[PDB]
């Protein structure tokens, strides 16, 4: 849908318009699902090689939960920079339109007359 | 890198002289110093029409006449 | 679900592998003189 | 033009001498002849190196047909470009038989 | 669409230069040095028009300075330059390189009696320049106006409002 | 009929497709490729493509098509109505386009196509001292560099792959 | 369009229903396959050729090469096949039914 | 996914072959190089959505003049009136029109 | 097969599909399809067995018969466009031409008719590369030629091709045939959701070639090639039933898990544009696809087929084969639904 | 020739653009005889 808007500058994972927005912080519940993620990735690698699930590996679990927060995190950037793009395009166009988005009036119940029907 | 090159040039000398030949073919054009005349002899041969350019006022080193001094020369290529 | 036209299949080998399911005996003849009978392999 | 009637002429030419060759012989009125081989009746056996020097052939003729353009190429002004895409060409026509040699393609026919 | 304007058959009624290809090619480097200016005023108009009738005027002066070029070979060197083209015209390819004490006689005989030097080699592919009085079309092409583009992205970029507004997610 | 010759040459193509689209036996359908290659040739000669003409016997029939006889003649151990009534079926239905686009000067199948002559799209001009067709086909050393890459490194995986897939190891 | 094309085309859909309606041999199937890549060398020549765009010219023999060397592929494909049944028919190839 | 290499790193791998209006070697024109560029020109940074019905003229013009199915329309119904007055003896060809007139240059 | 020329056939199949991702001229998508085609014949016939020679045989009949109709088509663009541009396409003919070639080239119904033959003749690495990275070069064709696909071709050829690998599986004991029928379907659902939102074809994809990955590898990893073999794993290794069960659970769309994901965002891209018939009537569909995926988990997971006593000789020898990537792969095929928003990086 | 052909215009141009186009061989050589079409139209292909 967007794909004219990021041709202009093709293959760019966070442009320098991404560095405006304010990045997600590193207690994230989204980052703390993708580590927790990186923590049951560490559990089935031990468990599928017949290791202790909890004791084997902690270098290795630690290397599971820090590459998957390191790829989330920049994911996660990417996430609200394309979702704020979004909004920026769609408030641009709704300026840029007065006429295909006219004020309704807000009319109260007084005027307004809904037909009523009797529950019984 | 002297023993080896003389047993397979007693052996393969068909493969040595292939390796040679080959090898003078790449190396060479980047040593020799007639490989910028081939270049300038293939863009000096004038294959279109030399579509000329509106005498705004200020061109000074084109020509008006093919005879005029100004303009790219070849007398480089009469002489060599 | 085995049917009446899917009943004569057999399911496939184990390995996938299947069975593969002579070389060649010339006559230079007398056509001095002598007859060959040549078992060749190509 | 020319070139068709030139055609035409040798294919005709060709086609007279064979029609002469399948045609003047058999008004001979000879003897009708009774009952007209290494191998006997066997089939023929599929030899695999003899397609394997076809298929050979037929892409280290493609590599040619890649290479055809070459007196015309030499003409170009980017030169440098020029020459480093015909001495890649034919450096992987060479790989190409370098390959063949090393991995035993060229065996039993060298 | 619109009649195309053709100019009609009095506006195509001119002196034709007719001479062969090897009367032309003998004579070639000497019209292209002496018939030098119309045919750049013309090639120039030939290119900047990119219209044949907008051409024609120019190239009668093309079709005028021709002719004065042979008819000036035709009063003082009319042999030597005969013995020169009989000489090219002998060849399939037409070739200069046989027929060089025929170009040198002509060339001598030009040289005195009309004072023309003969172009090196080099010249003739030169892009000379062209003083004219005719204007610089503003459209060669006929090209009507080019739709007007999209706007532009601009302004400073917030964050999405509420997130990303899918369903239940409050990020 | 001489102004048609193109045509004339492009039907004898299509029957030369017939010729072994019906699959008469893979060396007579060879033969029927080779006469149709031929034919084609004459169709890509006549409109000034003199080296792309001869790709086609060099490379298609003196290259490839020798080497799909080769294959078939180490097959196929030597010696239909399906084949001969495929065939006058095909060579009809393109013998009435001949005629419908002969007596309408018009004609559509799939897409409209003109009765006369091909002869009328041609240009007006020359080209100077060079075929535009060899020099484009020249260009494939200065501006067809990744072209080149790729072509090469395709027909040498073409020489890894068939010695590999040949080798039954 | 021009009346060349026609025939071009039509010669392509003659050997894509050869190709799309095999009888035996696995052979007569690749006569078929390179009858419609010689129609697709003659269509995009004379279409190259017609509109003289100049950098394209080298394009047929690049669908030329390729596509020879696909031919090359079947052959040895086909090789195989009768490297198991002694013949090429296609109606052998039925092992992956179950 | 169309990933933009070219365009990101600078590198020209297939452009030059995409259009008839390109770089063509020794400036060898197109039959149709003025109808294209007319074409892309119009076409360019509007979208495709736009351009099918904002730049009809000038790719109607550049269609007609790559297949000249009007042009070979026009010359059918000529040729084809031409024909039906020989045959009904109503018209004439000129002298210019049969061979007999010495042609210009 | 060397290591070295295996190594250089892999990079030839990566690169072919990475020259259609990248290019915009039309020559080099066909060069890229011939060089992936002309690079994957060798890992079909990996094992060398006539079941490999008749599934490349197959593979090369339907893959040459799709390149040149794609040809063609670029011809016949050639034709009405002048130009090569790797763009929408300036003919319904050259459009339904190319959509034809590259749904044989997907394996789309009815073009179908390959894809359950082939993964059965080849191993289950080069079935794994067919089923997912063979569907990456013509899906971005689709993607990019979307402005010119006829809607009622892609749908008919989506709806039949999820229609058909539904009921494919149901009678299928074979693995890989019951991967390839997935596979039929699955592309019935990229392609359906294509000419709406192609963003959520690309996070269909991704998701499929996650869950194909996975399965296959846990295939692999137990060399297991049917169902009564996949059975015997609960007495080898117990914690494989479990990954196969949740992978299973996953690629029939079973909520909260993160193969519930593509399709639920397809019917909430193809709701929007007011289809409320064609939705539904593919999740229904998909209902097949989830029996034969339950089927699976009852003879893996959810009981206990009888093994032999041959099988308490492999309890003695652990697991030596490098399962790439499985617990990634098993975690982001399972666990990855309250992540549903991140579908915006494919934009 | 075409005076009896209702609604039609002589010597309309095809394209919509008022540009010269450069003549088609059947623009130029359409009305005369096949001649001087097999003349210009395959004479240097043909010739030798
Ligand atoms: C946590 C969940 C994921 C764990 C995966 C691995 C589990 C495992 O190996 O367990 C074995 C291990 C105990 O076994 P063991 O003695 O070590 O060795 C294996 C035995 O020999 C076992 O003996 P056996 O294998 O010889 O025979 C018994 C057999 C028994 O098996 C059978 O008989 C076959 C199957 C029986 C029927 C099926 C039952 C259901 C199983 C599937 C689950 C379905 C529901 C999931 C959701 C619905 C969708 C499908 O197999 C097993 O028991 C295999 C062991 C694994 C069992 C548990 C499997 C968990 C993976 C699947 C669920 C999680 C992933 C998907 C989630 C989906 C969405 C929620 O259990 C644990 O260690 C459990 C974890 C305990 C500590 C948890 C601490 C959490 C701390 C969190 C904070 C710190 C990190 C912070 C990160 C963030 C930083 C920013
Ligand atoms: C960004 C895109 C990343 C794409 C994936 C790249 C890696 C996978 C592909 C290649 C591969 O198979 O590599 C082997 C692969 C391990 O997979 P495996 O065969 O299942 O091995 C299991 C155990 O490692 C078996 O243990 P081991 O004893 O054989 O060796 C211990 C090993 C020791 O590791 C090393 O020695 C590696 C360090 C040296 C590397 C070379 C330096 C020069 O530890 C580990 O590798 C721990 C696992 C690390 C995590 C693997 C997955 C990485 C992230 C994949 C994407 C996740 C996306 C989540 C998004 C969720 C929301 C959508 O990766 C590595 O060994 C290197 C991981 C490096 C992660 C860096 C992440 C940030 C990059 C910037
Ligand atoms: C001074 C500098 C430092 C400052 C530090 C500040 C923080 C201090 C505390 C540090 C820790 C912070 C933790 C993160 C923040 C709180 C997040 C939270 O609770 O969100 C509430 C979230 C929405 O509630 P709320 O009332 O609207 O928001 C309250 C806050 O404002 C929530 O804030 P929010 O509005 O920003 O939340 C954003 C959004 C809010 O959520 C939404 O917009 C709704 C959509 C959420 C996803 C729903 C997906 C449904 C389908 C899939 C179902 C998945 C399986 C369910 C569980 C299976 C078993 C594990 O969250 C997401 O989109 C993330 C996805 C859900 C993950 C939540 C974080 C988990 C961290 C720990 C991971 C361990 C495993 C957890 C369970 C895994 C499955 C979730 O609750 C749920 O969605 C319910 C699901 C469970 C939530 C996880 C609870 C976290 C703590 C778990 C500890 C126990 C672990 C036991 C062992 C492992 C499992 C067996
Ligand atoms: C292996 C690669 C061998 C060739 C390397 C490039 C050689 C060369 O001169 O390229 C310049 C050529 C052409 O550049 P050029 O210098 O001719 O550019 C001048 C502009 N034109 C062409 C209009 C005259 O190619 C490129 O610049 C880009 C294409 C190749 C880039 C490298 C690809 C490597 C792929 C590896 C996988
Ligand atoms: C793990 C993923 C690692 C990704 C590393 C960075 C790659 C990169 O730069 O990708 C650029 C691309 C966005 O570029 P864009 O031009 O918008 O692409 C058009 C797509 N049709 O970025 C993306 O497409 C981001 C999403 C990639 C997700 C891949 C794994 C799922
Ligand atoms: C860098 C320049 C360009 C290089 C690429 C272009 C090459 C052009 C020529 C094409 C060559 C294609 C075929 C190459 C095959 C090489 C492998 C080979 O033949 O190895 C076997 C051979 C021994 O032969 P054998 O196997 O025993 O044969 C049976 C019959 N007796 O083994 C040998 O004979 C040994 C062969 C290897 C050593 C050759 C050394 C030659 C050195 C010449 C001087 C230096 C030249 C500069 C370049 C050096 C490059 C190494
Ligand atoms: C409908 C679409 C096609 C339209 C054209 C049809 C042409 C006539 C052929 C009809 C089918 C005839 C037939 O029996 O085909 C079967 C045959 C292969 O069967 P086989 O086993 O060899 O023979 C026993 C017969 N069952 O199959 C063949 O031999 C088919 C060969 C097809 C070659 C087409 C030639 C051109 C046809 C006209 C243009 C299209
Ligand atoms: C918009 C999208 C753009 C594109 C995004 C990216 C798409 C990624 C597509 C992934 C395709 C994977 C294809 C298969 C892997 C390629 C290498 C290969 O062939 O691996 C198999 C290999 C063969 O080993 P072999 O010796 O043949 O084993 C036979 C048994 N003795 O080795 C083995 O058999 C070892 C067993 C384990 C192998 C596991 C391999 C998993 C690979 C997939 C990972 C998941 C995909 C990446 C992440 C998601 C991205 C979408």
Same mark, same amino acid.
């Given at each position: 849908?967007?794909? &004219?808007?990021?041709?202009?500058?093709?293959?760019?994972?966070?442009?320098?318009?991404?560095?405006?927005?304010?990045?997600?912080?590193?207690?994230?519940?989204?980052?703390?699902?993708?580590?927790?993620?990186?923590?049951?990735? &560490?559990?089935?690698?031990?468990?599928?090689?017949?290791?202790?699930?909890?004791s084997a590996g902690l270098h290795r679990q630690f290397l599971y939960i820090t590459s998957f927060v390191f790829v989330g995190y920049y994911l996660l950037k990417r996430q609200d920079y394309m979702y704020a793009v979004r909004d920026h395009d769609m408030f641009s166009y709704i300026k840029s339109h007065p006429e295909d988005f006219p004020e309704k009036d807000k009319k109260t119940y007084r005027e307004v007359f809904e037909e009523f029907h009797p529950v019984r | 890198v002297a023993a080896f090159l003389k047993n397979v040039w007693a052996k393969e000398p068909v493969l040595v002289a292939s390796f040679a030949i080959a090898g003078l073919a790449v190396i060479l054009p980047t040593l020799s110093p007639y490989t910028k005349y081939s270049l300038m002899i293939n863009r000096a041969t004038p294959y279109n029409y030399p579509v000329p350019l509106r005498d705004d006022g200020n061109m000074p080193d084109v020509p008006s006449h093919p005879q005029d001094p100004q303009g790219p020369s070849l007398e480089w290529l009469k002489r060599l | 679900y085995p049917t009446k036209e899917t009943a004569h299949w057999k399911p496939p080998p184990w390995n996938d592998v299947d069975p593969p399911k002579s070389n060649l005996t010339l006559n230079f003849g007398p056509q001095g003189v002598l007859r060959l009978v040549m078992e060749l392999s190509g | 033009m020319n070139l068709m009637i030139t055609l035409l002429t040798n294919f005709t030419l060709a086609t007279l001498l064979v029609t002469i060759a399948f045609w003047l012989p058999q008004l001979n009125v000879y003897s009708e002849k009774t009952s007209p081989d290494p191998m006997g009746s066997a089939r023929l056996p599929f030899s695999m190196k003899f397609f394997l020097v076809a298929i050979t052939f037929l892409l280290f003729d493609l590599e040619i047909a890649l290479l055809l353009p070459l007196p015309w190429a030499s003409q170009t002004t980017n030169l440098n470009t020029m020459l480093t895409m015909?001495?890649?060409?034919?450096?992987?026509?060479?790989?190409?038989?370098?390959?063949?040699?090393?991995?035993?393609?060229?065996?039993?026919?060298? | 669409?619109?009649?195309?304007?053709?100019?009609?058959?009095?506006?195509?009624?001119?002196?034709?230069?007719?001479?062969?290809?090897?009367?032309?090619?003998?004579?070639?480097?000497?019209?292209?040095?002496?018939?030098?200016?119309?045919?750049?005023?013309?090639?120039?108009?030939?290119?900047?028009?990119?219209?044949?009738?907008?051409?024609?005027?120019?190239?009668?002066?093309?079709?005028?300075?021709?002719?004065?070029?042979?008819?000036?070979?035709?009063?003082?060197?009319?042999?030597?330059?005969?013995?020169?083209?009989?000489?090219?015209?002998?060849?399939?390819?037409?070739?200069?390189?046989?027929?060089?004490?025929?170009?040198?006689?002509?060339?001598?005989?030009?040289?005195?009696?009309?004072?023309?030097?003969?172009?090196?080699?080099?010249?003739?592919?030169?892009?000379?320049?062209?003083?004219?009085?005719?204007?610089?079309?503003?459209?060669?092409?006929?090209?009507?106006?080019?739709?007007?583009?999209?706007?532009?992205?601009?302004?400073?970029?917030?964050?999405?409002?509420?997130?990303?507004?899918?369903?239940?997610?409050?990020? | 009929?001489?102004?048609?010759?193109?045509?004339?040459?492009?039907?004898?193509?299509?029957?030369?497709?017939?010729?072994?689209?019906?699959?008469?036996?893979?060396?007579?359908?060879?033969? *029927?490729?080779?006469?149709? &290659?031929?034919?084609?040739?004459?169709?890509?000669?006549?409109?000034?493509?003199?080296?792309?003409?001869?790709?086609?016997?060099?490379?298609?029939?003196?290259?490839?098509?020798?080497?799909?006889?080769?294959?078939?003649?180490?097959?196929?151990?030597?010696?239909?109505?399906?084949?001969?009534?495929?065939?006058?079926?095909?060579?009809?239905?393109?013998?009435?386009?001949?005629?419908?686009?002969?007596?309408?000067?018009?004609?559509?199948?799939?897409?409209?196509?003109?009765?006369?002559?091909?002869?009328?799209?041609?240009?007006?001009?020359?080209?100077?001292?060079?075929?535009?067709?060899?020099?484009?086909?020249?260009?494939?050393?200065?501006?067809?560099?990744?072209?080149?890459?790729?072509?090469?490194?395709?027909?040498?995986?073409?020489?890894?792959?068939?010695?590999?897939?040949?080798?039954?190891? | 369009?021009?009346?060349?094309?026609?025939?071009?085309?039509?010669?392509?859909?003659?050997?894509?229903?050869?190709?799309?309606?095999?009888?035996?041999?696995?052979?007569?199937?690749?006569?078929?396959?390179?009858?419609?890549?010689?129609?697709?060398?003659?269509?995009?020549?004379?279409?190259?050729?017609?509109?003289?765009?100049?950098?394209?010219?080298?394009?047929?023999?690049?669908?030329?090469?390729?596509?020879?060397?696909?031919?090359?592929?079947?052959?040895?494909?086909?090789?195989?096949?009768?490297?198991? @049944?002694?013949?090429?028919?296609?109606?052998? #190839?039925?092992?992956?039914?179950? | 996914?169309?990933?933009?290499?070219?365009?990101?790193?600078?590198?020209?791998?297939?452009?030059?072959?995409?259009?008839?209006?390109?770089?063509?070697?020794?400036?060898?024109?197109?039959?149709?190089?003025?109808?294209?560029?007319?074409?892309?020109?119009?076409?360019?940074?509007?979208?495709?959505?736009?351009?099918?019905?904002?730049?009809?003229?000038?790719?109607?013009?550049?269609?007609?003049?790559?297949?000249?199915?009007?042009?070979?329309?026009? #010359?059918?119904?000529?040729?084809?009136?031409?024909?039906?007055?020989?045959?009904?003896?109503?018209?004439?060809?000129?002298?210019?029109?049969?061979?007999?007139?010495?042609?210009?240059? | 097969?060397?290591?070295?020329?295996?190594?250089?056939?892999?990079?030839?199949?990566?690169?072919?599909?990475?020259?259609?991702?990248?290019?915009?001229?039309?020559?080099?998508?066909?060069?890229?399809?011939?060089?992936?085609?002309?690079?994957?014949?060798?890992?079909?016939?990996?094992?060398?067995?006539?079941?490999?020679?008749?599934?490349?045989?197959?593979?090369?009949?339907?893959?040459?018969?799709?390149?040149?109709?794609?040809?063609?088509?670029?011809?016949?663009?050639?034709?009405?466009?002048?130009?090569?541009?790797?763009?929408?396409?300036?003919?319904?003919?050259?459009?339904?031409?190319?959509?034809?070639?590259?749904?044989?080239?997907?394996?789309?119904?009815?073009?179908?008719?390959?894809?359950?033959?082939?993964?059965? *003749?080849?191993?289950?690495?080069?079935?794994?590369?067919?089923?997912?990275?063979?569907?990456?070069?013509?899906?971005?064709?689709? @993607?990019?030629? #979307?402005?010119?696909?006829?809607?009622?071709?892609?749908?008919?050829?989506?709806?039949?091709?999820?229609?058909?690998? *539904?009921?494919?599986?149901?009678?299928?004991?074979?693995?890989?045939?019951?991967?390839?029928?997935?596979?039929?379907?699955?592309?019935?659902?990229?392609?359906?959701?294509?000419?709406?939102?192609?963003?959520?074809?690309?996070?269909?994809?991704?998701?499929?070639?996650?869950?194909?990955?996975?399965?296959?590898?846990?295939?692999?990893?137990?060399?297991?090639?049917?169902?009564?073999?996949?059975?015997?794993?609960?007495?080898?290794?117990?914690?494989?039933?479990?990954?196969?069960?949740?992978?299973?659970?996953?690629?029939?769309?079973?909520?909260?898990?993160?193969?519930?994901?593509?399709?639920?965002?397809?019917?909430?891209?193809?709701?929007?544009?007011?289809?409320?018939?064609?939705?539904?009537?593919?999740?229904?569909?998909?209902?097949?696809?989830?029996?034969?995926?339950?089927?699976?988990?009852?003879?893996?997971?959810?009981?206990?087929?009888?093994?032999?006593?041959?099988?308490?000789?492999?309890?003695?020898?652990?697991?030596?084969?490098?399962?790439?990537?499985?617990?990634?792969?098993?975690?982001?095929?399972?666990?990855?639904?309250?992540?549903?928003?991140?579908?915006?990086?494919?934009? | 020739?075409?005076?009896?052909?209702?609604?039609?215009?002589?010597?309309?141009?095809?394209?919509?653009?008022?540009?010269?186009?450069?003549?088609?061989?059947?623009?130029?050589?359409?009305?005369?005889?096949?001649?001087?079409?097999?003349?210009?139209?395959?004479?240097?292909?043909?010739?030798?």
């Amino acid at each position: 849908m967007m794909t &004219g808007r990021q041709a202009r500058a093709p293959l760019q994972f966070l442009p320098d318009e991404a560095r405006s927005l304010p990045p997600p912080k590193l207690t994230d519940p989204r980052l703390a699902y993708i580590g927790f993620l990186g923590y049951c990735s &560490g559990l089935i690698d031990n468990a599928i090689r017949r290791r202790p699930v909890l004791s084997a590996g902690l270098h290795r679990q630690f290397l599971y939960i820090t590459s998957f927060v390191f790829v989330g995190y920049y994911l996660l950037k990417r996430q609200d920079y394309m979702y704020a793009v979004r909004d920026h395009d769609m408030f641009s166009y709704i300026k840029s339109h007065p006429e295909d988005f006219p004020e309704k009036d807000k009319k109260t119940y007084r005027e307004v007359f809904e037909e009523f029907h009797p529950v019984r | 890198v002297a023993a080896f090159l003389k047993n397979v040039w007693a052996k393969e000398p068909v493969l040595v002289a292939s390796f040679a030949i080959a090898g003078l073919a790449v190396i060479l054009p980047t040593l020799s110093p007639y490989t910028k005349y081939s270049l300038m002899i293939n863009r000096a041969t004038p294959y279109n029409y030399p579509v000329p350019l509106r005498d705004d006022g200020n061109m000074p080193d084109v020509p008006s006449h093919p005879q005029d001094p100004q303009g790219p020369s070849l007398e480089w290529l009469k002489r060599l | 679900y085995p049917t009446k036209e899917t009943a004569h299949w057999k399911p496939p080998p184990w390995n996938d592998v299947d069975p593969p399911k002579s070389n060649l005996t010339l006559n230079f003849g007398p056509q001095g003189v002598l007859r060959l009978v040549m078992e060749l392999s190509g | 033009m020319n070139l068709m009637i030139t055609l035409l002429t040798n294919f005709t030419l060709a086609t007279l001498l064979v029609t002469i060759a399948f045609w003047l012989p058999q008004l001979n009125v000879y003897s009708e002849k009774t009952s007209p081989d290494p191998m006997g009746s066997a089939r023929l056996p599929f030899s695999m190196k003899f397609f394997l020097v076809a298929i050979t052939f037929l892409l280290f003729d493609l590599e040619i047909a890649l290479l055809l353009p070459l007196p015309w190429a030499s003409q170009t002004t980017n030169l440098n470009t020029m020459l480093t895409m015909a001495l890649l060409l034919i450096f992987l026509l060479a790989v190409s038989l370098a390959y063949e040699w090393t991995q035993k393609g060229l065996e039993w026919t060298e | 669409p619109g009649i195309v304007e053709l100019p009609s058959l009095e506006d195509l009624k001119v002196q034709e230069v007719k001479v062969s290809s090897s009367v032309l090619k003998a004579a070639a480097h000497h019209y292209g040095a002496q018939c030098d200016k119309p045919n750049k005023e013309f090639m120039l108009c030939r290119w900047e028009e990119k219209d044949p009738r907008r051409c024609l005027e120019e190239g009668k002066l093309v079709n005028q300075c021709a002719l004065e070029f042979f008819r000036q070979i035709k009063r003082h060197c009319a042999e030597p330059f005969t013995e020169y083209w009989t000489c090219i015209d002998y060849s399939g390819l037409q070739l200069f390189r046989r027929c060089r004490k025929e170009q040198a006689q002509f060339d001598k005989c030009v040289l005195d009696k009309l004072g023309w030097v003969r172009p090196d080699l080099g010249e003739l592919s030169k892009v000379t320049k062209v003083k004219t009085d005719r204007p610089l079309p503003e459209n060669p092409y006929h090209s009507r106006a080019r739709p007007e583009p999209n706007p532009e992205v601009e302004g400073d970029l917030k964050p999405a409002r509420h997130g990303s507004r899918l369903f239940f997610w409050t990020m | 009929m001489m102004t048609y010759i193109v045509f004339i040459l492009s039907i004898i193509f299509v029957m030369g497709f017939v010729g072994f689209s019906s699959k008469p036996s893979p060396i007579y359908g060879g033969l *029927g490729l080779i006469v149709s &290659g031929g034919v084609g040739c004459g169709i890509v000669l006549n409109f000034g493509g003199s080296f792309l003409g001869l790709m086609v016997f060099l490379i298609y029939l003196g290259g490839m098509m020798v080497v799909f006889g080769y294959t078939t003649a180490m097959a196929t151990e030597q010696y239909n109505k399906v084949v001969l009534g495929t065939f006058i079926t095909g060579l009809l239905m393109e013998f009435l386009m001949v005629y419908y686009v002969l007596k309408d000067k018009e004609v559509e199948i799939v897409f409209k196509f003109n009765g006369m002559g091909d002869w009328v799209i041609y240009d007006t001009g020359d080209s100077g001292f060079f075929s535009e067709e060899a020099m484009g086909i020249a260009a494939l050393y200065s501006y067809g560099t990744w072209l080149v890459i790729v072509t090469g490194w395709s027909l040498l995986i073409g020489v890894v792959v068939i010695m590999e897939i040949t080798r039954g190891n | 369009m021009s009346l060349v094309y026609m025939n071009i085309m039509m010669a392509f859909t003659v050997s894509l229903t050869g190709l799309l309606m095999y009888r035996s041999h696995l052979m007569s199937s690749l006569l078929c396959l390179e009858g419609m890549m010689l129609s697709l060398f003659i269509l995009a020549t004379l279409m190259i050729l017609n509109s003289h765009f100049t950098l394209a010219s080298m394009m047929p023999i690049i669908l030329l090469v390729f596509a020879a060397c696909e031919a090359a592929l079947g052959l040895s494909l086909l090789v195989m096949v009768s490297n198991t @049944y002694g013949t090429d028919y296609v109606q052998n #190839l039925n092992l992956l039914q179950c | 996914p169309f990933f933009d290499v070219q365009k990101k790193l600078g590198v020209d791998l297939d452009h030059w072959m995409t259009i008839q209006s390109a770089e063509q070697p020794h400036r060898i024109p197109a039959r149709c190089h003025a109808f294209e560029k007319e074409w892309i020109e119009c076409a360019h940074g509007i979208g495709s959505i736009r351009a099918e019905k904002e730049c009809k003229i000038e790719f109607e013009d550049f269609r007609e003049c790559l297949l000249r199915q009007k042009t070979m329309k026009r #010359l059918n119904a000529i040729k084809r009136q031409r024909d039906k007055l020989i045959k009904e003896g109503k018209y004439t060809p000129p002298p210019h029109h049969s061979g007999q007139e010495d042609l210009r240059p | 097969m060397n290591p070295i020329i295996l190594i250089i056939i892999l990079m030839t199949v990566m690169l072919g599909t990475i020259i259609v991702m990248i290019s915009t001229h039309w020559l080099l998508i066909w060069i890229g399809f011939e060089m992936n085609m002309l690079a994957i014949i060798p890992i079909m016939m990996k094992k060398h067995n006539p079941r490999a020679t008749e599934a490349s045989t197959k593979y090369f009949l339907t893959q040459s018969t799709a390149s040149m109709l794609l040809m063609m088509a670029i011809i016949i663009n050639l034709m009405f466009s002048g130009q090569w541009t790797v763009m929408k396409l300036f003919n319904p003919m050259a459009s339904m031409l190319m959509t034809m070639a590259l749904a044989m080239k997907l394996g789309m119904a009815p073009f179908h008719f390959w894809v359950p033959e082939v993964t059965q *003749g080849i191993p289950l690495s080069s079935g794994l590369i067919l089923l997912t990275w063979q569907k990456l070069a013509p899906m971005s064709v689709l @993607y990019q030629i #979307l402005p010119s696909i006829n809607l009622d071709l892609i749908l008919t050829l989506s709806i039949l091709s999820i229609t058909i690998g *539904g009921w494919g599986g149901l009678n299928q004991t074979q693995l890989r045939k019951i991967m390839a029928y997935s596979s039929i379907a699955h592309m019935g659902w990229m392609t359906a959701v294509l000419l709406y939102n192609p963003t959520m074809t690309l996070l269909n994809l991704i998701i499929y070639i996650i869950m194909t990955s996975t399965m296959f590898t846990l295939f692999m990893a137990n060399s297991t090639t049917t169902t009564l073999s996949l059975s015997h794993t609960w007495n080898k290794a117990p914690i494989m039933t479990i990954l196969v069960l949740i992978t299973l659970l996953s690629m029939g769309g079973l909520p909260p898990l993160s193969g519930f994901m593509p399709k639920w965002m397809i019917i909430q891209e193809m709701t929007k544009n007011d289809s409320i018939i064609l939705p539904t009537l593919m999740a229904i569909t998909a209902l097949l696809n989830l029996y034969f995926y339950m089927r699976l988990t009852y003879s893996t997971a959810l009981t206990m087929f009888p093994s032999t006593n041959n099988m308490k000789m492999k309890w003695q020898f652990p697991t030596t084969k490098r399962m790439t990537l499985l617990p990634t792969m098993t975690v982001l095929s399972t666990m990855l639904l309250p992540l549903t928003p991140i579908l915006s990086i494919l934009e | 020739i075409m005076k009896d052909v209702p609604g039609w215009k002589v010597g309309e141009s095809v394209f919509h653009t008022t540009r010269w186009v450069t003549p088609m061989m059947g623009e130029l050589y359409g009305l005369r005889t096949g001649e001087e079409i097999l003349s210009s139209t395959y004479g240097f292909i043909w010739y030798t």
